[PDB]
Paper text:
One of these highly populated repetitive folds is the αα-solenoid (SCOP a.118), whose most widespread superfamily is the tetratricopeptide repeat (TPR; a.118.8). The ﬁrst crystal structure of a TPR domain showed that the repeat units are helical hairpins, stacked into a continuous, right-handed superhelical architecture with an inner groove that mediates the interaction with target proteins. Here we show that such hairpins are detectable and that one of them, from the ribosomal protein RPS20, can be customized to yield a TPR fold by repetition, with only a small number of point mutations that are neutral for the parent organism. We concatenated three copies of RPS20-hhta as an initial construct, connected by the TPR consensus loop sequence (DPNN).
M4NΔC is M4N without stop helix. We conclude that in the amplified constructs, the observed interactions are more favorable than the interaction with the native stop helix, releasing it and rendering it prone to degradation. This led us to ask whether this helix is in fact dispensable. Indeed, an M4NΔC construct, which terminates with the B3 helix, showed the same stability and dimerization as M4N. We obtained two structures for M4NΔC from different crystal forms at 2.0 Å and 1.7 Å resolution, respectively, the first (CF I) with two dimers in the ASU and the second (CF II) with a single chain in the ASU, for which we constructed the dimer by crystallographic symmetry. (a) Two dimers in the ASU of M4NΔC CF I. (b) Dimer constructed by applying the crystallographic symmetry to the single chain in the ASU of M4NΔC CF II. All three dimers superimpose to the M4N dimer with Cα RMSD below 1.9 Å.
Residue numbers in the entry:
A (entry chain B): 1 to 105
B (entry chain A): 1 to 107
Write the structure that this text describes.
């Protein structure tokens, strides 16, 4: 609803290279529903796109905690951790994703 | 106009449910610089969100081929493949990514 609208505006501003405003609207969107995985991941990726990897990782951990079996979230978190030089933890989450993929098949 | 303009126009068009036009403009953006990894990933994401998973996979594969050590590209591709039910190849890309992370960590 309003979350989707805020998300659209945010992503438009970001795709136009105006990331700070995008982050403002995104934080609003997350505030409206703090348990939405999609919006949390969106916020995270916007923060990471700005070089702020730590806060991004925070929100990604939140999203993972919301659903530990989603391989997209696990993979994304793993990527963020790897970019920050946390090899062991990244490899851990990636391998968890591998296990889930192999299990579902 | 530029790649940025065409790409964002494509994004808003997609948001308006004008997927055909969106893909048109995003492909126009690609044509200006066919080996641009960023644009390729953008088109891939667009195709994926519209349901066109297979095409998206093809463009993600080209992206990987342009830079095979990018773990973001490898991971995104793997997630897509797994989504389409291609478990083994997805796992292969993820283990590639893991090997790269370990290799980079070892210095």
């Amino acid at each position: 609803n309003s979350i989707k609208t805020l998300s659209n505006l945010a992503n438009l501003l970001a795709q136009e290279g105006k990331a700070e405003e995008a982050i403002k609207y995104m934080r609003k969107a997350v505030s409206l529903d703090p348990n939405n995985i999609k919006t949390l991941s969106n916020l995270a990726n916007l923060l990471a796109q700005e070089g702020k990897a730590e806060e991004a990782i925070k929100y990604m951990r939140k999203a993972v905690s919301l659903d530990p079996n989603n391989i997209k979230t696990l993979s994304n978190l793993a990527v963020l951790l790897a970019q920050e030089g946390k090899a062991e933890e990244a490899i851990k989450y990636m391998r968890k994703a591998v296990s889930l993929i192999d299990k579902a098949a």
